[PDB]
């Protein structure tokens, strides 16, 4: 929906451009600044909703404990769940940040500045990361004591 | 509505002058003879009226559209070039007697 709105807006801007009006680029720049501010606000809302969801559709990540050659092992390890969570948060961010810019390089091709366009500053970003660092920590904690049982094999009768 | 002194633009032409011409245009054939100075004035006003009325309607339309523009300030920046060319033509014309 965001891409469609941007496409229609860009089509209207191009229609203005072909009519050969006066002083287009500065108007385009100002409207781009406003639209990126609105994008930053919407990104803030989506990111905070995602964060509280962690604490917005989220994929369910699952990993197992197994044993082989009589050693306890994880599949995948806890850092892998960490990296999947980071990837999913990046995809959620990219939902808004991958949007193209409006014009008459890579940064110029599509808008990647909304993080600095943040209405509340990086806090909403940072707390999101915090949830990750929260959850994973708790995970390994619940793992740790349980994993302790493997010691039973390391001692022999 | 505004404390400032507005320098509203007008046209140096009373709309009622053509009215006088019509009186002459009617009285001349009624048999009454009018002073020749009045005849010349009425004839000149009658032949010059189209320019005056076109000018006044044009300036009124321009004022209406420009106030409509400035009502929505988000567009004046785009319209600036057209407003400049209009003001340039106005500047050229105002010098004329």
């Amino acid at each position: 929906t965001f891409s469609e709105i941007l496409n229609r807006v860009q089509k209207a801007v191009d229609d203005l451009n072909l009519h050969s009006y006066s002083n287009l680029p500065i108007w385009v720049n100002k409207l781009d600044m406003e639209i990126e501010r609105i994008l930053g606000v919407r990104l803030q809302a989506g990111l905070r909703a995602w964060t509280q969801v962690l604490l917005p559709k989220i994929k369910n990540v699952v990993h197992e404990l197994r044993i082989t050659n009589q050693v306890i092992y994880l599949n995948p390890p806890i850092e892998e769940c960490r990296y999947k969570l980071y990837q999913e948060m990046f995809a959620w961010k990219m939902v808004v940040l991958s949007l193209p810019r409006i014009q008459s390089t890579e940064e110029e091709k599509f808008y990647r500045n909304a993080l600095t366009r943040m209405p509340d500053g990086p806090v909403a970003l940072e707390e999101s990361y915090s949830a990750v660092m929260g959850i994973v920590s708790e995970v390994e904690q619940y793992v740790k004591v349980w994993l302790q049982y493997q010691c039973l094999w390391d001692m022999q009768a | 509505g505004r404390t400032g002194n507005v320098l509203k633009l007008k046209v140096n032409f009373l709309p009622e002058i053509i009215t006088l011409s019509k009186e002459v245009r009617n009285l001349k054939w009624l048999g009454f003879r009018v002073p020749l100075a009045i005849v010349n004035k009425a004839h000149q006003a009658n032949q010059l009226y189209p320019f005056a009325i076109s000018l006044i309607e044009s300036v009124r339309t321009y004022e209406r559209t420009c106030e409509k523009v400035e009502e929505r300030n988000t567009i004046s920046l785009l319209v600036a070039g057209l407003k400049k060319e209009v003001q340039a033509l106005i500047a050229e014309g105002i010098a004329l007697v």
């Binding site: - | 320098l7 420009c66 004046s76 106005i90």
Partner: peptide
Amino acid sequence: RKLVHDKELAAEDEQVFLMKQQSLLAKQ
């Protein structure tokens, strides 16, 4: 050396232009 757009088209608010031309009419 990526050139940027120069000064944009100005507005030159109607009141100022009208005042200047009122002065010019007064002096002519």
